[PDB]
Design a protein around this ligand. Sequence first.
Ligand SMILES: CCCCCCc1ccccc1CCCCC(=O)N[C@H](CO)COP(=O)(O)O
Lengths: 338, 290, 222, 54, 232
Amino acid sequence: ELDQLRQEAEQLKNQIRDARKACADATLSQITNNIDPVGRIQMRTRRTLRGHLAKIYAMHWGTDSRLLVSASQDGKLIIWDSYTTNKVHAIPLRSSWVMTCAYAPSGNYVACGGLDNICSIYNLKTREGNVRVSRELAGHTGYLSCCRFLDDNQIVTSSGDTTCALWDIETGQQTTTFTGHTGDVMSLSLAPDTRLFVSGACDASAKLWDVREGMCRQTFTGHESDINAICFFPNGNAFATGSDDATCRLFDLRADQELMTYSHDNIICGITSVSFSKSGRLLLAGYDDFNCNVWDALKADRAGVLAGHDNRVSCLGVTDDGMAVATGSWDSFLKIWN
Amino acid sequence: QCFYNESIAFFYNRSGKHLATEWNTVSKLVMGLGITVCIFIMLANLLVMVAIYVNRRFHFPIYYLMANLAAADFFAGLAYFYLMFNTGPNTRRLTVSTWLLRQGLIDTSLTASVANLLAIAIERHITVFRMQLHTRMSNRRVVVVIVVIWTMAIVMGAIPSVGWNCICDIENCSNMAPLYSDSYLVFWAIFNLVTFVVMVVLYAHIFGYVRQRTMRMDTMMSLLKTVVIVLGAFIICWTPGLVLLLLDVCCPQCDVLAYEKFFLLLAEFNSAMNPIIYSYRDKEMSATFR
Amino acid sequence: SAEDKAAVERSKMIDRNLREDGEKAAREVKLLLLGAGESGKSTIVKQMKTGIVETHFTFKDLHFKMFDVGGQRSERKKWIHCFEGVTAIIFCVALSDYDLVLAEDEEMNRMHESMKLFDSICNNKWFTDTSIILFLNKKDLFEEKIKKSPLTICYPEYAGSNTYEEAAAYIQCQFEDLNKRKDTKEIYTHFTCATDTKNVQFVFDAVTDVIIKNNLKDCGLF
Amino acid sequence: SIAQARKLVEQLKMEANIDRIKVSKAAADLMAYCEAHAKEDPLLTPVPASENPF
Amino acid sequence: VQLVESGGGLVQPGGSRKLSCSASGFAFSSFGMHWVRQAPEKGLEWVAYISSGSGTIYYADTVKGRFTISRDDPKNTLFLQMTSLRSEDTAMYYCVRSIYYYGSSPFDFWGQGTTLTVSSSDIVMTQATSSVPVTPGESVSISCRSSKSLLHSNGNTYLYWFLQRPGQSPQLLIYRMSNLASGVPDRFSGSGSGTAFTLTISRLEAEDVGVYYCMQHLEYPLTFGAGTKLEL
Ligand SMILES: CCCCCCc1ccccc1CCCCC(=O)N[C@H](CO)COP(=O)(O)O
């Protein structure tokens, strides 16, 4: 019966909640009491990339920390050069409604997707020198919210159909499908070793997935509303989520709990993007206050602010080498902060 | 035969004008009303320009030309304020260079105000007749027309100060401005007259278009109120002066000199009213007032 | 560098195509389409000519793009903000749904469900300024339906005859009362007309009015 | 919705049956990695304009 | 992706002839094109260049004001208008394509060129090795020297390499030092700095025997080097 399993199921949530208390020896705020603070993080707009004629929804650095991609509703996907601010490629999209971007770790491929329910993959290095679309991954039934390449052949995507998928670009079929989310999935982050990836969904939960098996390892709760951004700590043993509760929270995978919450009474708008620093001591979070905050990730004290945008900060990515932090926004401008 | 030889005296006495060596009831009264109008122009435009610059809201081409009108009117206030403290017995202390400085300031200031009004009219015609919603706006045409207005104002205020004046033909020149020529007065007045009729045709086309298209589907009342108050300020504050200048340059023995000191006051009252005619409707900017 | 100089020639050649493409897209008119499943949006789309479906058509040298987003079946709260900046929101309601009920719910009328969707759209924080064209479809079937069934089944309070003219008029005004932004957005309501091919012409007149009234705002002449 | 409940119960049972490390130890590990890679972080300690690509 | 050129043949001196190169199979409108001529017995020599969309047209010292170069993007053709040919213009006129963006490979594809026989502050690259004997399976190094520091401020040493097999068009091997072109085996490698450059082949075959060239791209007019023929 429904009741037998439900009265059973609510018990299984207890042992999980019971054990998490037993492993709550002391709060990170208590352990990190004697760390010297980070100091004022004064970060200035070095470069400003112009040429989008609509709001920007996604951007992603390259593994070389110099080139980057950005999409907007203008139906243009532009590959920028951050050093010289000059446009390398401007890819026309079939669908103006794009919500995500990814630049392949090899830099040969770039991928974008949105309300068209398709993840289109564009080939950059092409004998005839004109970025051409290689494959169109059509197996989702809701808007694609995020996508991150594993190799030049594996891409994992998260959609509004409450499911994530791992694809095989050559065959164009979902090698694995991750189901378990009870709400619309908003963002995913791959681990440094590319063996696990955590996803955040509208059901105020984040789930740690296994890319090979295709089953969810752990599920983290604690937010109160939608989770809009997620990123791992550089060491892959922690991650942070940005929600509409205007709080960012740092979860651990080993301890399976929540460590910090980055809330300030003054902040009441929702976090749109989060990202870490190369060392993981700074957690940069892009709010809807039209500005972007920089948090001390072990003290939870808002040390520094990057306010330069007219409209909301949609996307916020840091480079692999950590020399720079770039924020997009609905004001149609990408700004490189250093 | 040119006589930069003659002093201010020769010029007035050659015309019908009177130096007014002592102050007068009329003179004290006009000085008071003029200084009042000048103080009002200066204060009102400082608020308009400060507001149009401080708010990121008012950072669009229409508001740019509005701020330009506020500055041109502030310049007019300064010219009329300097014309005062140079009238009545003070005029007797003038030299030909200084008098020309005074009249040139008046010319360039008013010409700039009139050109701003026509430019705001040409911009509203452009803005209304576009068939798009957003139209990513540049700051090119606004700053181009800002420099055309000011270039034409300075060249108009300097032409008599250099070449186009009756230092050379005593016989053929004005009764009021004893030195500018009937040719320069005809030019300035016909320039202002054609500018007004161009403002009238543009705002008529705006109203005809809005009428047909929106009534095919109250906006008529608000639009005709705004149209009628914009053209009216101009007509009730310029038609005096313009008809008077034409009378001076066409009709001999037309007693035009008596109501001169007053009609100029009216023309400067126009620049007084402009900051409030162009800021009364915009609820946001109007409230911005603190 | 000689290579870098040529690089900047691309970036300028890119930017001159992005401006030309941006100015081509600005001339296009962006209408969002919404409504219930059985609204008649299908029938409207036919007269005008998975995922988010686009329809392109031209009338009197104006280009229209209609975004039929009925097929998303996900939470509107996360992707509706994509459509801020549409000229107008076409909204279709079927007049013949006053006496029915949704196939899923017990006794919540289809017409009452249409209002719940209309309340959330007209008062959505993303469309504070956006005008709403409101098509009321299947008007002829509503005439036949009202002549036999009462309108009290859907609206409990109603003083008025079962006549087409008055029955309809109450609904139109009942839909028009949902907006709190009374003097910010204008709802242009039309009864769907088959043969005249006026449904497209009503969209034309309603869109121009939204453009002409907007043009009067940014130029301050209003 | 019989299947949904049945699929649900084994999911948590697998979720509950994992090794959990104390927050004390995990806390230290995040503190240790940040201090070990601190002096390699451009944003934490600003880098002179000579080595700043921007 | 083939490039073929038309014209050439036999022309009396002082005559004006036109060379047309019909691009086919690639995005011709977004490629900066060149012309490179090779004398019947001598090495390569750059002559002309057009940027993308005819925005920038350059010329060599010997052909300045004598040659007119034009492109017809819709028809995917490239034109060269030659005026008053001299006896020193006898060369095979290859057509080269190149695209300039961050990380691109200019001079990657070379046309077959046309034969033209007329009747009758500049960087200098120097390589003093010619007809070097080598055996298959051995390791050979080819050295190049410049008269100027090619290492630009950003760190790009704009030195290129080429390989011309006997009776074939030149083929790019290395588009900048410590870089490897597309479709060329890993055996070719190049390491150098400032004015000293080397090209190292680990193990070769009968396929890669021929003459090698060195080109700089630091500044126009893209002076080439003399040949370096591998003898086998
Ligand atoms: C120079 C022409 C430019 C165009 C006309 C400006 C204008 C407009 C409307 C009324 C008047 C004018 C100027 C009239 C002279 C200037 C003055 O100030 N007059 C008064 C009249 O009582 C004496 O000043 P003053 O002799 O006391 O110094």
